[PDB]
């Protein structure tokens, strides 16, 4: 309790995002990151719709878009002729932001710092002890071992999570059967076609400048450790069927696989997990970091609330309840996509043909678009029956002010407080909310939503806690307010 409120283990993008969220929630956040210096990641990155919407409601979207290429559509499982159609989903931001992870990390690190989080680099957590009041973290640092005492510890320490094992949380799942290499390497060859291809021997992307030079190589072969330029070239030759001249300078080289695992519990007492610490899977569709950043924004406000007292144990438990199912579906969909890309002219090629056809129908395209981009995420939480809007994402709504001015809910959410939106003129609900005004802001505005709602009680993460029609009463809102956001003041 005495060193800090929350110790965030791991200063990757997820840990950094969480620290920002905890600071926005008015609690102390100490990030302990093992590495002195950041390391290399894929130089191509993707933040999809719901992540973009999430950044917007935290006021980070602008800095993430500056200088950024965006994609207005996406392939699906190596199908490029019927791309995922952002027009078929409801958003104010129909695009994917192609931000390299290194840049996402740098931006979040600066934000955590400006928000007052303490970030210690070269500090490795080596031990973890928990009792009814606090967590103690043991740390190997540049000036020797020391202990940190906190109310909570969150493992944001990646796929090889120290926190997860120390807390005795299971990581059930499958081991890899697919072997991929990725690299940024040089070719002397000119006019190497820039494309993805699928042969009987694997999947290959080559993306080099037409004049030669440093380029992107991804190679995937069906049924961990150092990678050499020779390894990469041999793999490329196997898949492609023709050698490609690859030379120094070599900028980055890595291995990855399709091991698919998920933490059985996202919470064990005063220890929680987020990001790859909580789920790993093959990188297909660019979903891992998106899921993690959203884990962080789900958790941050709830954990700060718990520390401050008005967030209940029940509330904190909804982190696992809400977010475990999401990553579960991500694991499954990445595995499914690997089946859809399997090199095999006999059966899989014909299947891909029908899937491609189906992608040209609005209903199926909408399904896979919602899946990849996160627009289909909604929660079933604290059911009383619930209003249709309960659990839906409201972060992208825009209201009309009394003078006709646009009032984006994304902007209202930047202060990281829950909001009561009065869409219809419900002075009774506005008044009923007064005893919670130390926590919840009330904003009246004109808007029609579908399905209809006269009022929306919105969580700091942009999802709707409670909603009301003309039949809703102040008593019902009082009950929801108490359950979600604690007892009335005074």
Ligand X SMILES: Cc1cc2nc3c(=O)[nH]c(=O)nc-3n(C[C@H](O)[C@H](O)[C@H](O)COP(=O)(O)OP(=O)(O)OC[C@H]3O[C@@H](n4cnc5c(N)ncnc54)[C@H](O)[C@@H]3O)c2cc1C
- What DSSP string describes 27-68? --EEEEES-SS-----S---B-HHHHHHHHHTT-HHHHHTT-
- Tell me which of a second copy, ligand X, none is bound by residue 258, counting a contact when its beta carbon lies within the kind-specific cut-off of 5 to 8 angstroms: a second copy
Question: Is 228 marked as a binding-site residue?
Answer: no
For the CB of residue 114, give the shortest distance to a second copy in the complex, in Å. 42
Report whether 98 contacts 68 (CB < 8 A).
Answer: yes
Residue from 294, 333, 369, 454 binding a second copy (CB under 8 A): 333
35 binds a second copy (CB under 8 A): no
For the CB of residue 385, give the shortest distance to a second copy in the complex, in Å. 23
Q: Backbone phi, then psi, for 399, in 5-degree steps? A: -100, 165
Question: Is 333 marked as a binding-site residue?
Answer: no
Q: Residue 429, preceding bond cis, omega within 30 degrees?
A: no
The β-bridge relationship of strands 73-76 and 70-71 is unpaired
350 binds a second copy (CB under 8 A): yes
Distance separating alpha carbons of residues 323 and 262, to the nearest angstrom: 11
Where on the chain is the footprint of ligand X (CB under 6 A)?
9-15, 32-35, 41-42, 45-46, 101, 124-125, 156-158, 162, 182, 256, 275-277, 283, 286-290, 292
Question: Is 276 marked as a binding-site residue?
Answer: yes
| Planar angle of CA 20, 23, 28, nearest 5 degrees | 120
157: alpha, beta or left? (left if phi > 0; alpha if psi -120 to 50): alpha
Question: Is 298 marked as a binding-site residue?
Answer: no
Question: Is 344 marked as a binding-site residue?
Answer: no
174 binds a second copy (CB under 8 A): yes
Question: Is 289 marked as a binding-site residue?
Answer: yes
Identify which of residues 323 and 417 has a Cβ nearer to ligand X in the complex: 323
For the CB of residue 200, give the shortest distance to ligand X in the complex, in Å. 24
In 258-352, the DSSP E strands lie at 260-262, 267-268, 271-273, 279-280
For the CB of residue 254, give the shortest distance to ligand X in the complex, in Å. 6
Distance separating alpha carbons of residues 73 and 380, to the nearest angstrom: 29
Question: Is 336 marked as a binding-site residue?
Answer: no
Site for a second copy, residues 251 to 290, rule: CB under 8 A: 258
Give the torsion sign (CA, 479, 481, 485, 490).
negative
Identify which of residues 166 and 359 has a Cβ nearer to a second copy in the complex: 359
Annotated binding site: 14, 33, 46, 101, 125, 162, 276, 286, 289-290
Annotated binding site for FAD: 14, 33, 46, 101, 125, 162, 276, 286, 289-290
């Amino acid at each position: 309790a005495l060193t800090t409120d929350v110790v965030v283990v791991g200063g990757g993008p997820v840990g950094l995002m969480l620290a920002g969220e905890l600071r926005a929630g008015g609690v102390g956040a100490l990030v302990l990151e093992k590495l002195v210096e950041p390391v290399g990641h894929d130089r191509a990155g993707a933040l999809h719709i719901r992540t973009v919407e999430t950044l917007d409601l935290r006021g980070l979207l602008d800095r993430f878009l500056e200088g950024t290429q965006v994609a207005k559509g996406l392939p699906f499982a190596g199908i490029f002729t019927q791309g995922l159609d952002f027009g078929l989903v409801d958003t104010r931001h129909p695009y994917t932001a192609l931000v390299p992870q290194s840049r996402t990390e740098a931006l979040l690190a600066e934000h955590a710092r400006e928000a007052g989080a303490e970030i210690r680099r070269g500090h490795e957590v080596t031990g973890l002890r928990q009792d009814a009041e606090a967590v103690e973290v043991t740390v190997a640092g540049p000036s020797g071992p020391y202990r940190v005492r906190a109310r909570y510890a969150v493992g944001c320490d990646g796929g090889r999570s120290t926190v997860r094992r120390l807390a005795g949380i299971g990581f059930p799942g499958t081991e890899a059967t697919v072997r991929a290499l990725i690299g940024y390497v040089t070719t002397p060859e000119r006019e190497v076609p820039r494309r993805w291809e699928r042969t009987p021997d694997g999947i290959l992307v080559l993306a080099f400048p037409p004049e030669g030079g440093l380029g992107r190589v991804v190679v995937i072969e069906y049924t961990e450790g150092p990678v050499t330029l020779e390894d990469l070239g041999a793999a490329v030759a196997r898949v492609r069927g023709t050698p490609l001249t690859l030379t120094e300078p070599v900028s980055w080289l890595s291995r990855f696989g399709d091991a698919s695992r998920q933490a059985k519990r996202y919470r064990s007492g005063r220890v929680l997990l987020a990001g790859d610490a909580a789920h790993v899977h093959f990188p297909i569709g660019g979903q891992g970091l998106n899921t993690g950043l959203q884990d962080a924004v789900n958790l941050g406000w709830k954990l700060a609330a718990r520390v401050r007292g008005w967030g209940s144990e029940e509330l904190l438990d909804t982190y696992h309840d809400e977010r475990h199912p999401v990553a579960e579906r991500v694991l499954l969909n990445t595995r499914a996509q690997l089946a859809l890309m399997r090199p095999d002219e006999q059966h899989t090629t014909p299947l891909r043909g029908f899937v491609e056809e189906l992608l040209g129908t609005d209903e199926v395209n909408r399904y896979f678009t919602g899946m990849i981009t996160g627009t289909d995420v909604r929660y079933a939480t604290f059911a009383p029956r619930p209003h249709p809007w309960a659990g839906r994402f409201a972060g992208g709504l825009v209201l009309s002010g009394p003078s006709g001015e646009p009032v984006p809910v994304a902007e209202l959410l930047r202060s990281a407080r829950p909001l009561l939106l009065d869409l219809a003129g419900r002075a009774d609900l506005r008044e009923a909310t007064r005893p919670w005004s130390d926590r919840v802001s009330v904003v009246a505005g004109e808007a029609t939503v579908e399905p209809p709602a006269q009022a929306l009680l919105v969580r700091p993460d942009g999802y709707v806690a409670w909603a009301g029609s003309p039949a809703a009463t102040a008593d019902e809102l009082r009950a929801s307010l108490a359950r979600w956001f604690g007892p009335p003041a005074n």
